[PDB]
């Protein structure tokens, strides 16, 4: 559960991202693919060459769902609903993998806010991403 010091923290850290978000979102992904090649299997139809619009495009889509989630941190399940429905029934990505992308995101963020990234914030963020991962993993079975 996210305390409210948690919400203040996620809102302020993601505010500094503001518009570099599709950018940080495409970077997170490149890092997942390189650090955990296993995540590659859910993307055989992508050109994962560094810089391909396919991944740049997916990352703006992923960063945007994340921004929408931070904007609704109090009513998250309803907000990410159609998406929980998506991954759950058409896509079916194994949940062990949300833990993986969640981490490269933690990492992509650590490398761009030299220092908004406080240990107290590093914590609220891991925490926030675990919540998003859980809502999205929710209607699986």
């Amino acid at each position: 559960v996210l305390s409210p010091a948690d919400k203040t923290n996620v809102k302020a850290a993601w505010g500094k991202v503001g518009a570099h978000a599709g950018e940080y979102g495409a970077e997170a992904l490149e890092r997942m693919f390189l650090s955990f090649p296993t995540t590659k299997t859910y993307f055989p139809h992508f050109d994962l060459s560094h810089g391909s619009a396919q991944v740049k495009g997916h990352g703006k889509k992923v960063a945007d769902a994340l921004t929408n989630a931070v904007a609704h941190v109090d009513d998250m399940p309803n907000a990410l609903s159609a998406l929980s429905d998506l991954h759950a029934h058409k896509l079916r990505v194994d949940p062990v993998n949300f833990k993986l992308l969640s981490h490269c995101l933690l990492v992509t963020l650590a490398a761009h806010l030299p220092a908004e990234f406080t240990p107290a914030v590093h914590a609220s963020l891991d925490k926030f991403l675990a919540s998003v991962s859980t809502v999205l993993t929710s209607k699986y079975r």
Binding site: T38, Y42, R141
Partner: protein, 146 residues
């Protein structure tokens, strides 16, 4: 990292009692039902909709045994499972695109189906030997992803 002879004598005899065709249709069947997102790689297969349509689907029953016989055969080179499955590994990565996390999921449904079948004969110490086996099989099947 491997096994004690008391280990391997163990998984070896429990297995001489296994009817592979029918125990495989069962684990693959239960994998699809308990972790329904494994359904993912199989709508070439038909009715996969209720636990009953799946445990009875013949395509499931068939690949279930294909998989398990692939496995019975590795019971034989418990000494180098990596060399035994290198081609099947390359294939599941390059062509099938299966999240290797699934080998682990199936490894566990299988320890479960073995417990169901042999009841008290499947003792904690015998499960431990097979947890080692199922884990090494999943590990060898994934050795070549990239």
């Amino acid at each position: 990292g491997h096994f004690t002879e008391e280990d391997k004598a163990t998984i070896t005899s429990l297995w001489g009692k296994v009817n592979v065709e029918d125990a495989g249709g069962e684990t693959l069947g239960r994998l699809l039902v308990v972790y329904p997102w494994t359904q993912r790689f199989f709508d070439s297969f038909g009715n996969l909709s209720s636990a009953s349509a799946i445990m009875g689907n013949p395509k499931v029953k068939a690949h279930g045994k294909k998989v398990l016989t692939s496995l019975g055969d590795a019971i034989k080179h418990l000494d180098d499972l990596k060399g035994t499955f290198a081609q099947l590994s390359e294939l599941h990565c390059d062509k099938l695109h299966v999240d290797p996390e699934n080998f682990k999921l199936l490894g566990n449904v299988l320890v479960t189906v073995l417990a169901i079948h042999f009841g008290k004969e499947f003792t904690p110490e015998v499960q431990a030997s097979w947890q080692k086996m199922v884990t090494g099989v999943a590990s060898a099947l994934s050795s070549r992803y990239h």
